[PDB]
Ligand binder design. Structure first.
Ligand code: CA
Ligand code: CA
Ligand code: CA
Ligand code: CA
Lengths: 199, 199
């Protein structure tokens, strides 16, 4: 079992000093997945946005600390449920290889609390995707039940055979806000991708 | 734990007498999910199609018999990988209810063998979806590795909270050929949907 390197896999860049502080710009090492043009190029607190946030002692958002390190990665969509999806994408340098089983793990957070008198209860749903090239090889579309204030680990697996059409294409990861409920924000942390011989 | 009734949930209708025989028309109780217009209204052996097939002693397709009963449900797509998706859909009379955990199970088959000198080795990928109204609540996009000649059970879970936007909409099930590999056909059997109080 070997790890595949991922840039800023725990959203630890940038460092954030103050409890419950956050950014509203795409985290370093990631791009914004924006198939429905829901997230604007220039973001502020109340536009749809993504960014990083510090989860440490003092936090109103969780009954635990960040799954890894200090920070999580966050995606907020202000449009009504049903309007589309958005999130994080990263294309890796590793390529799809035959007779290999890929295991993608990421922690998904349903933050609770209240922000400027707006309840953060509720959840939009999530999807975690493993890609080769432009193809979604395997995905967890919203299978875990995550209560307000907790994280759960999503696991996505895929086995590439020697006849897979997408061998030698670049691997990729997407972490998606489904916008299928309110409050329509969620967090991700601790992205891990490992490889092993196929079963 | 209570079962939700599904029509023709094991594809046992119509009865098929002869080993490895099949139909090419939408199974009773189901509709054809056809978002990319890949499946024609009138089907024959070599068009894209769906239907039912008998898997019994004598079969070339599996190292086991049908997971349930005599028959499976099958979807073949003749277009090149990447062209889109198609499969089975059924809208149920049950509606989405709050504080309830849904468990959707279906057996997914990767048939092997050879048909008219064409190898059936390889697999297109699958997705199993649980719906309310037009919304995919939860889905297993291709997480199981299924070798030629075997079936594996896919499990999809979803918990509906009292604030879910889709409460009171009709539940639905989709069983999808992803068309992400060749030979681009697969089978499904033994659709089961159960309900229980939320965790
Ligand atoms: Ca982290
Ligand atoms: Ca929440
Ligand atoms: Ca059956
Ligand atoms: Ca096959």
């Amino acid at each position: 079992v070997v790890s595949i390197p991922i840039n800023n896999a725990g959203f630890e860049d940038p460092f954030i000093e103050v409890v419950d502080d956050y950014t509203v710009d795409t985290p370093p090492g990631w791009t914004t997945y924006n198939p429905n043009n829901l997230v604007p190029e220039k973001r502020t607190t109340w536009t749809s946005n993504n960014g990083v946030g510090y989860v440490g002692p003092g936090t109103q958002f969780y009954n635990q600390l960040a799954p890894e390190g200090r920070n999580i990665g966050s995606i907020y969509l202000a449009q009504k449920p049903g309007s589309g999806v958005a999130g994080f994408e990263q294309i890796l340098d590793a390529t799809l290889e035959p007779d290999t089983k890929y295991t993608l793990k990421v922690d998904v957070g349903n933050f609770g609390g209240e922000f400027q008198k707006i309840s953060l209860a509720g959840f939009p749903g999530y999807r975690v995707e493993l890609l080769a090239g432009d193809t979604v090889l395997a995905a967890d579309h919203n299978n875990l039940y995550i209560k307000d204030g907790e994280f759960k680990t999503s696991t996505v697996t895929f086995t590439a055979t020697p006849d897979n059409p997408y061998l030698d294409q670049k691997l990729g990861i997407r972490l998606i806000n489904l916008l299928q409920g309110t409050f329509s924000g969620l967090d991700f942390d601790n992205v891990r991708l490992t490889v092993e011989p196929a079963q």
